[PDB]
Design an enzyme around this catalytic site. Structure first.
Site, mmCIF file in Angstrom:
data_model
loop_
_atom_site.group_PDB
_atom_site.id
_atom_site.type_symbol
_atom_site.label_atom_id
_atom_site.label_comp_id
_atom_site.label_asym_id
_atom_site.label_seq_id
_atom_site.Cartn_x
_atom_site.Cartn_y
_atom_site.Cartn_z
ATOM 1 N N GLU A 116 0.963 -1.118 0.112
ATOM 2 C CA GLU A 116 -0.116 0.029 -0.089
ATOM 3 C C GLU A 116 0.880 1.137 -0.046
ATOM 4 O O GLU A 116 1.861 1.301 0.698
ATOM 5 C CB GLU A 116 -0.909 0.102 1.299
ATOM 6 C CG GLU A 116 -2.118 1.191 1.194
ATOM 7 C CD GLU A 116 -3.103 1.066 2.320
ATOM 8 O OE1 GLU A 116 -2.828 0.263 3.212
ATOM 9 O OE2 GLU A 116 -4.103 1.710 2.059
ATOM 10 N N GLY A 123 2.218 2.055 11.419
ATOM 11 C CA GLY A 123 2.075 0.996 12.458
ATOM 12 C C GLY A 123 1.754 -0.277 12.157
ATOM 13 O O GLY A 123 2.480 -1.198 12.694
ATOM 14 N N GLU A 177 -2.679 -3.936 6.598
ATOM 15 C CA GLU A 177 -3.743 -5.223 6.493
ATOM 16 C C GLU A 177 -3.942 -6.318 5.456
ATOM 17 O O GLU A 177 -4.914 -6.641 5.009
ATOM 18 C CB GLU A 177 -5.333 -4.512 6.654
ATOM 19 C CG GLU A 177 -5.774 -3.856 5.319
ATOM 20 C CD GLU A 177 -5.256 -2.430 5.032
ATOM 21 O OE1 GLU A 177 -4.306 -1.890 5.823
ATOM 22 O OE2 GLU A 177 -6.152 -1.872 4.345
ATOM 23 N N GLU A 184 -5.978 -3.555 12.055
ATOM 24 C CA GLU A 184 -5.916 -4.670 10.980
ATOM 25 C C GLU A 184 -6.934 -5.568 10.873
ATOM 26 O O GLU A 184 -7.405 -5.898 9.699
ATOM 27 C CB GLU A 184 -4.544 -5.042 10.905
ATOM 28 C CG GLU A 184 -3.242 -3.957 11.259
ATOM 29 C CD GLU A 184 -3.320 -2.764 10.226
ATOM 30 O OE1 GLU A 184 -4.046 -2.819 9.395
ATOM 31 O OE2 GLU A 184 -2.982 -1.630 10.881
ATOM 32 N N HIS A 195 -10.162 -4.434 9.247
ATOM 33 C CA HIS A 195 -9.945 -4.053 7.566
ATOM 34 C C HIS A 195 -10.748 -5.329 7.103
ATOM 35 O O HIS A 195 -10.885 -5.188 5.899
ATOM 36 C CB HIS A 195 -8.438 -3.837 7.423
ATOM 37 C CG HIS A 195 -7.916 -2.256 7.474
ATOM 38 N ND1 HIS A 195 -8.900 -1.311 6.826
ATOM 39 C CD2 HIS A 195 -7.022 -1.657 7.922
ATOM 40 C CE1 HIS A 195 -8.566 -0.363 6.736
ATOM 41 N NE2 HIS A 195 -7.177 -0.326 7.379
HETATM 42 C C1 LIG Z 1 -0.835 3.885 13.140
HETATM 43 C C2 LIG Z 1 -1.942 3.803 11.994
HETATM 44 C C3 LIG Z 1 -3.007 2.788 12.548
HETATM 45 C C4 LIG Z 1 -2.432 4.971 11.500
HETATM 46 C C5 LIG Z 1 -1.399 3.054 10.999
HETATM 47 O O1 LIG Z 1 -0.468 2.199 11.024
HETATM 48 N N1 LIG Z 1 -1.997 3.078 9.664
HETATM 49 C C6 LIG Z 1 -1.590 2.164 8.522
HETATM 50 C C7 LIG Z 1 -3.188 1.513 8.136
HETATM 51 O O2 LIG Z 1 -4.287 2.181 7.990
HETATM 52 N N2 LIG Z 1 -3.007 0.282 8.630
HETATM 53 O O3 LIG Z 1 -4.270 -0.388 8.584
HETATM 54 C C8 LIG Z 1 -1.214 2.700 7.452
HETATM 55 C C9 LIG Z 1 -0.669 1.514 6.617
HETATM 56 C C10 LIG Z 1 0.176 1.834 5.315
HETATM 57 C C11 LIG Z 1 0.236 3.243 5.128
HETATM 58 C C12 LIG Z 1 1.091 3.644 4.079
HETATM 59 C C13 LIG Z 1 0.848 4.353 2.973
HETATM 60 C C14 LIG Z 1 1.835 4.536 1.709
HETATM 61 F F1 LIG Z 1 1.497 5.151 0.826
HETATM 62 C C15 LIG Z 1 3.041 3.849 1.915
HETATM 63 F F2 LIG Z 1 4.032 3.875 1.054
HETATM 64 C C16 LIG Z 1 3.513 2.967 2.958
HETATM 65 F F3 LIG Z 1 4.712 2.382 3.177
HETATM 66 C C17 LIG Z 1 2.464 2.977 4.030
HETATM 67 C C18 LIG Z 1 -0.107 4.154 5.806
HETATM 68 C C19 LIG Z 1 -0.546 3.973 7.114
HETATM 69 ZN ZN LIG Z 2 -5.794 1.056 8.138
#
Ligand SMILES: CC(C)(C)C(=O)N[C@@H](C(=O)NO)c1ccc(-c2cc(F)c(F)c(F)c2)cc1
Ligand SMILES: [Zn+2]
Ligand SMILES: [Mg+2]
Length: 889
Positions: free
Chosen positions: A124, A265, A268, A302, A305
């Protein structure tokens, strides 16, 4: 630099039905072979076949097993592979390629990369194209058949999505595994992991169909003892989606994997969730308390999701908040149910009104569904996530739990297995809204403005009470300031959860009531109101807005003491503090500007201090709530209310206000610090990793907050307490002893003691770094230089870099030193980091987000550093785009 516009969405002229991968990992190279079974879509107009592919080394490409010739039939420019239409088949065909990539030198942690001795992917948003050629967008759904091969001694554990259907030996000490994942998915949910992983596991039986699900949690061998809480959280998550939403897991197995190097963090990936180690691993000996809520929320996030993102997925990236806002909302419901502490909801409001409100009033302001992007890596914002979550939560406030659940189930049943848009969700919610209101005429068309309109609304109030008529009125007004996204802001659908408190006995005077404000202003009238009430407004923080309650401090105190809603009590305290802060700030500012030899400060309201004492001394009151009321509002919350904020003057204001309150309450603080010890530091369950007590952790939070207030104040002999605290088995306690010792000559003694305790656990050492970084030290610059030379060195681990620098940036007096040296220091680190990890370099820009909010000297100092960064020849696309937007260029 290409700008993508939301309005320009069109389906591809191609289809990818099947992906068949062979990923052969070697020490100096990874060979990726890919066969794509493809077709021509109904939208095809005979265009060139263009694949995304970034940083790929072509060994060969072919169409239907016939080799393609570079120059004549295709071109590759390290970003796009173009195959000229005349060579593109007109019906079903096979495209294949073999490329070389290098995870071992991939320090940006996107695509396939090496984290310590684990090979891991992060796809992602558009990282799959760094692994092999693809039409790398989430509406290109395909089936995946993936084989991984590797050296067996170094990489005994091989994982990918789907079912492991074969394992086999390979000559030369290698070994392979094939995974077949028949359900369609977007490529950003692809993942592969290879490593010497150790695990804990359990079997979960689903609530309704009684399916057996295997659960595995993985880490490197050294930290296998830190996996137990994650596993419990996963079980908890599964049960919650079952109990609240009636949703069970659909796959035979779910793997969670911790890696040391991760940009965010966790991620998923279907059946294979991959985590920053700091968001999966903990033990009571080697983690601070915060880790336990962190792991609960990230594991939960996660897991949720799997429905909201994986089974119902995104049409395009502009719909990001449809999976992120909704999943954060689901995670917040989960965490509130698991922790059963009011501070859980308060902490999310605290984060929103400080960090996201700052973002929403900055030049970076965007709606939760933006109209454009250049860098997808820059799109994952607190606005999209946390304001997104509050917008998803308002549906629940408006509908109530029964109709919210009906609407949510409509959404899932209708869109399961398909892509969706924010409109699809609003449509589902609208159906429930019709049912609740009992007429098919009701609609939520106005609600869509929450997705398109940027900026924080302001909601203000006036009151009227007719004593003879027993009639009470709440007149409400809403306003959003114009910004670069809308010249003309429209009124939103704002749900206002309210109560009316009888100030004479503290009782509720009306039943649960949610005001639906749909106009610029409205007047809400209540009859049979026996006495003049105090209104309890936006209970639970029912809309993401600036609340202007227009209450007196007397009214706010009465609410703080007697209201039933934790958020309104906390907000009333917040509002009393803010009035005080603004008043003293202006008095200090004028004395500075006018160079006064003498002047007066308005003291803190004595009845307010009395009410704080009352709550603190109440044995039945909540420990976590208590720690909020003795803490001034966050600096980043305060800055929303001050133009040309002079950070020194604000530091003097906070100082005066804390000293005023401590001068009256320190003996109370001390007494509580002592009496809380027994329950707060109870060791009964210290060696039971499955036993987590959020109330007890809030008690430690209070003690550590009190100890901080007592240390700053140089309370008589508090250093004795500090030294004993450093001997506590709990890292929250002994790391607190380091930061509060800053005010004493024992600081570097505790520095060395706690370093020695922290240095042999990767994550604990990162918490130590943060503790040092945020220490209130006059010699903090010299200390940072020591960390750099002795501990951080040239680590490219984002956890290390963020731990050393980000907490220091919250040092109001020192980061903002008028020389600009703190701005210089952080910009140097951003530019350095940008060479190998542009995403994390952009994260390290966070302090600059408020630059145009500060006094004019500091604006200029910050702007100079940003322009210096912008002028670096080798600046990444990520960082350039971000700073260009931030500096209004
Ligand atoms: C701490 C939070 C929960 C805000 C988090 O880890 N967010 C990730 C997420 O929503 N997991 O379900 C998350 C995951 C991937 C990315 C992401 C986006 C990109 F464009 C990248 F290049 C990348 F390496 C990670 C950003 C945030
Ligand atoms: Zn997320
Ligand atoms: Mg390391």
């Amino acid at each position: 630099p290409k700008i993508h516009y939301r309005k320009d969405y069109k389906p591809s002229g191609f289809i990818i039905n099947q992906v068949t991968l062979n990923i052969n990992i070697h020490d100096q190279e990874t060979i990726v072979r890919s066969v794509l079974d493809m077709d021509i879509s109904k939208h095809n107009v005979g265009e060139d076949l263009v694949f995304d592919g970034v940083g790929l080394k072509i060994n060969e490409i072919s169409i239907n097993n016939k080799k393609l010739v570079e120059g004549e039939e295709y071109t590759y420019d390290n970003e796009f592979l173009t195959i000229f239409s005349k060579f593109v088949p007109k019906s079903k065909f096979a495209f294949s390629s073999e490329v070389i990539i290098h995870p071992e030198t991939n320090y940006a942690l996107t695509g396939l990369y090496k984290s310590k001795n684990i090979i891991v992917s992060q796809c992602e948003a558009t990282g799959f194209r760094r692994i092999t050629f693809f039409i790398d967008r989430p509406d290109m759904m395909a089936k995946y058949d993936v084989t991984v091969t590797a050296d067996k001694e170094k990489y005994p554990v091989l994982l990918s999505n789907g079912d492991k259907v074969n394992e086999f030996e390979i000559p030369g000490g290698r070994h392979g595994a094939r995974f077949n994942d028949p359900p369609l998915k977007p490529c950003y949910l692809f993942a592969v992991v290879a490593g010497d992983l150790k695990h804990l596991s359990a079997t979960y039986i689903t609530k309704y169909t009684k399916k057996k699900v295997e659960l595995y949690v993985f880490s490197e061998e050294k930290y296998v003892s830190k996996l137990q809480w994650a596993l419990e959280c996963l079980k908890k998550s599964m049960a919650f989606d079952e109990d609240y939403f009636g949703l069970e897991y659909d796959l035979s197995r779910l793997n969670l994997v911790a890696v040391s190097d991760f940009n965010v963090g966790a991620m998923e990936n279907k059946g294979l969730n991959i985590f920053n180690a700091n968001s999966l691993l903990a033990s009571k000996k080697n983690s601070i308390d915060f880790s336990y809520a962190r792991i609960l929320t990230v594991v939960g996030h996660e897991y949720f999701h799997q429905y909201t993102g994986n089974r119902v997925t995104l049409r395009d990236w502009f719909q990001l908040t449809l999976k992120e806002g909704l999943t954060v909302h689901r995670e917040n419901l989960f965490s509130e149910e698991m922790t059963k502490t009011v501070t859980t909801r308060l902490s999310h409001v605290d984060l929103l009104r400080s960090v996201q409100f700052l973002e929403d009033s900055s030049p970076l302001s965007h709606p939760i569904r933006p109209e454009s992007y250049v860098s997808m890596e820059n799109f994952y914002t607190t606005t999209v996530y946390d304001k997104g979550s509050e917008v998803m939560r308002m549906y629940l406030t408006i509908l109530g739990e029964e109709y919210y659940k009906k609407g949510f189930d409509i959404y899932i049943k209708k869109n399961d297995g398909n892509t969706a848009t924010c409109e699809d969700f609003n449509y589902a919610m609208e159906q429930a809204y019709k049912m609740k209101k009992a007429d098919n005429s009701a609609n939520l068309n106005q609600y869509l403005l929450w997705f398109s309109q940027s900026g924080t609304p302001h909601v203000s109030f006036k009151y009227n009470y007719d004593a003879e008529k027993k009639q009470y009125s709440i007149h409400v007004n809403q306003y959003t300031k114009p910004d670069e996204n809308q010249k003309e802001k429209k009124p939103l659908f704002i749900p206002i959860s309210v109560g009316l408190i009888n100030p004479e006995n503290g009782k509720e005077m009306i039943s649960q009531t949610t005001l639906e404000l749909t106009k610029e202003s409205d007047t809400f009238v209540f009859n049979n109101i026996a006495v003049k009430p105090i209104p309890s407004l936006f209970r639970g923080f029912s809309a993401p807005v600036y609340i202007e309650d227009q209450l007196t401090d007397e009214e706010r105190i009465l609410l703080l003491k007697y209201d039933s809603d934790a958020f309104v009590r906390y907000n009333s305290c917040t509002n009393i503090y803010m009035k005080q802060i603004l008043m003293n700030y202006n008095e200090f500012l004028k004395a500075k500007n006018e160079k006064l030899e003498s002047f007066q400060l308005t003291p803190v309201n004595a009845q307010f201090i009395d009410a704080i004492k009352y709550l603190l001394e109440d044995p039945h009151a909540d420990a976590g709530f208590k720690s909020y009321i003795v803490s001034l509002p966050q600096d980043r919350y305060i800055i929303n209310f001050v133009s040309n904020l002079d950070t020194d003057v604000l530091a003097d204001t906070k100082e005066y206000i804390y000293k005023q309150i401590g001068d009256k309450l320190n003996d109370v603080y001390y007494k509580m610090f002592k009496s809380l010890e027994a329950k707060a530091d109870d060791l009964t369950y210290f060696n039971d990793e499955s036993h987590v007590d959020f109330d007890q952790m809030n008690m430690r939070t209070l003690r550590n907050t009190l100890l901080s207030l007592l240390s700053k104040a140089q309370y008589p002999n508090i250093l004795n307490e500090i030294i004993e605290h450093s001997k506590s088995p709990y890292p929250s306690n002994w790391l607190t002893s380091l930061s509060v010792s800053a005010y004493f000559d024992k600081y570097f003694e505790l520095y060395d003691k706690t370093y020695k305790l922290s240095k042999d656990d990767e994550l604990l050492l990162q918490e130590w770094l943060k503790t040092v970084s945020r220490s209130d030290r006059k010699d903090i610059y010299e200390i940072l230089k020591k960390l750099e030379n002795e501990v951080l060195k040239d680590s490219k681990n984002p956890n290390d870099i963020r731990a050393v620098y980000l907490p220091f940036t919250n040092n109001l007096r020192r980061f903002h030193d008028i020389s600009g040296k703190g701005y210089k220091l952080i910009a140097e680190v951003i530019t350095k980091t940008d060479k190998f990890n542009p995403m994390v370099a952009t994260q390290l820009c966070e302090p600059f987000k408020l630059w145009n909010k500060l006094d004019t000297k500091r604006q200029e100092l910050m702007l100079n550093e940003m322009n210096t960064m912008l002028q670096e020849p080798q600046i990444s696309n990520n960082l350039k785009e971000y700073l260009l937007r931030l500096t209004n260029k």
